[PDB]
């Protein structure tokens with residue numbers, strides 16, 4: 001478990017790799033995989049759709065029963081549920097969707113959830129169709145997370161831009 005390999009070390013606790021988070025979860029067998037969730041835990045699109053399909057929809061069935069009784073999460077909040085075949089636990093984290101006018105300042109609160117876990121496999125929060133500046137998201141991660149975080153970014157041009165920008 002937690003067999004991470006091939007990552008660039010950005011800081012003493014933040015690592016990054018150009019990889020699909022689903023393929024990393026299958027290789028690594030992490031204690032925790034982070035999902036780039038939304039408040040009603042509808043696992044479509046982006047990371048969430050890929051993670052749920054890799055569980056053959058088990059993640060969606062569990063998430064629907066959670067939401068039915070507990071209601072939606074808040075932006076910046078999180079929820080631990082089963083990791084199914086991908087991890088021991090899945091930490092569902094809601095970053096702000098700035099393309100839908102949500103508050104970018106809540107991105108810090110979204111990464112603060114990672115500090116409850118010693119080591120995590122995670123995506124870059126609020127990137128992709130959520131619209132945040134990826135360079136900004138990586139800075140908020142580095143400044144906020146104190147535990148060991150292994151970021152999987154599934155886009156070579158974005159990965160190459162993030163690393164170049166970070167190394168300036």
Ligand SMILES: CC(C)[C@H](Nc1ncnc2[nH]c(-c3cnn(CC(=O)N(C)C)c3)cc12)c1ccc2c(c1)OCCO2
Pocket residue numbers: 019020021022036037045046047050123124125126127128129130152153154155158
């Ligand atoms: C910024 C981008 C690159 C990032 N996406 C990702 N980051 C890391 N691992 C990822 N895997 C996939 C994926 C999708 N489909 N598949 C199956 C596949 O390709 N097969 C051929 C079987 C794998 C996407 C992905 C991101 C991060 C956060 C976000 C966000 C997006 O969407 C909205 C919410 O927040």
